[PDB]
Amino acid sequence: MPAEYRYKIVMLGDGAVGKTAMTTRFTQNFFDTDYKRDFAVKRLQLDDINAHVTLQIWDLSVRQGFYRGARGGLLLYDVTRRRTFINIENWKEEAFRSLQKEIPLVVVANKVDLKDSRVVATEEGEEYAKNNSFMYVESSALTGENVEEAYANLCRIMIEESKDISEMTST
Ligand SMILES: Nc1nc2c(ncn2[C@@H]2O[C@H](COP(=O)(O)OP(=O)(O)O)[C@@H](O)[C@H]2O)c(=O)[nH]1
Numbered sequence: 001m002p003a004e005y006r007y008k009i010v011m012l013g014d015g016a017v018g019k020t021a022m023t024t025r026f027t028q029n030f031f032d033t034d035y036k037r038d039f040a041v042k043r044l045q046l047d048d049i050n051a052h053v054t055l056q057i058w059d060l061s062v063r064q065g066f067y068r069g070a071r072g073g074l075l076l077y078d079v080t081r082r083r084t085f086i087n088i089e090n091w092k093e094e095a096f097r098s099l100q101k102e103i104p105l106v107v108v109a110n111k112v113d114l115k116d117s118r119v120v121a122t123e124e125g126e127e128y129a130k131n132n133s134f135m136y137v138e139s140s141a142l143t144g145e146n147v148e149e150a151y152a153n154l155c156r157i158m159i160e161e162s163k164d165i166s167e168m169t170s171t
Contacts, residue, residue, distance in 0.1 A: 002045065007158050008056040008069050009151075012091040013076030014084040018110040019059050021141035022076065026151055027057065031142050038066070044155060053155045067098040072158045074150060075134070076108045077125075080117040085124070092132070104157040106135045108150050113140040 011019040020037050024030065027040045042055045058066060075091060077084040088107065096102055107129040109120065122138065129136035135157070137150040 002050045002052040005051060005053045005155075005159055005162060006056075007053065007071045007155070008039070008058060009154065009158075010067060010070045010073040010095065011057065011059040011076065012073050012088075012095060012105075013108075013110075014078070014081075014087050014091075017076045017078040017081075017084050018141050019076055022074070022108070022110060022139065022147055022150075023057050023059055025141040025144055025147045029144075031144075042151070044152065046152065046155060046159075049156075049159070051159060053159070055151070055155070063094070064098055067095055070095070070099065070103060071161075072104045072154045073106075074108050074154060075105045076110050077120065078111050079109050079120045079125075079138075080111055080114050082119050085120045085128075088128070104134075104154060104161065105132070106137055106150055106154045106157075107132075109136070109138045111140060111142075112138045112145065113143050 011023060013019055021031060023040050024035055027042045039056045039058045044053045060066060075088050077088050107125055109125045126136050135153050137146050139146045139150055141147060
């Protein structure tokens with residue numbers, strides 16, 4: 001039998017960066033320009049470590065309830081709009097201030113299928129993530145590229161932090 005984990009996570013980023021589309025791709029495995037949209041649920045098996053994760057995936061007084069109890073998040077920007085890349089630091093700070101602690105974040109450069117209108121280079125997002133010891137993923141909700149991987153990476157990080165805490169409480 002697999003180990004069982006449960007986490008609330010938050011989708012962060014400016015409007016129209018693809019938070020809903022990424023969540024829809026992850027939980028329903030499709031994409032629709034005309035998808036009409038507080039949380040979605042995903043049950044995910046991680047074979048490598050025989051672990052089963054149940055995720056509550058939250059997506060935008062209200063902000064404090066939005067963040068409360070989150071153990072991780074995806075920090076999205078739209079690679080075709082530099083202003084959304086500039087603002088990921090503001091989202092990180094808002095989340096950390098609301099929670100009064102750091103939580104693991106995976107930096108997600110979304111919409112990479114839009115090659116001809118991309119303005120934020122891969123190396124810029126890698127550098128921001130590296131400065132914060134965040135992982136970095138290039139994703140497309142449209143094609144599905146690396147969408148599951150982004151959530152899976154975050155899941156594994158939260159599981160390792162759960163294990164860390166188990167050890168700290170067991171000295
Ligand atoms: N080409 C492309 N379009 C995307 C992608 N992700 C989202 N979109 C589109 O970008 C727009 C904004 O996405 P949405 O999910 O509403 O962003 P949200 O406001 O952050 O939840 C919608 O028209 C989506 O269909 C993507 O990965 N590639």
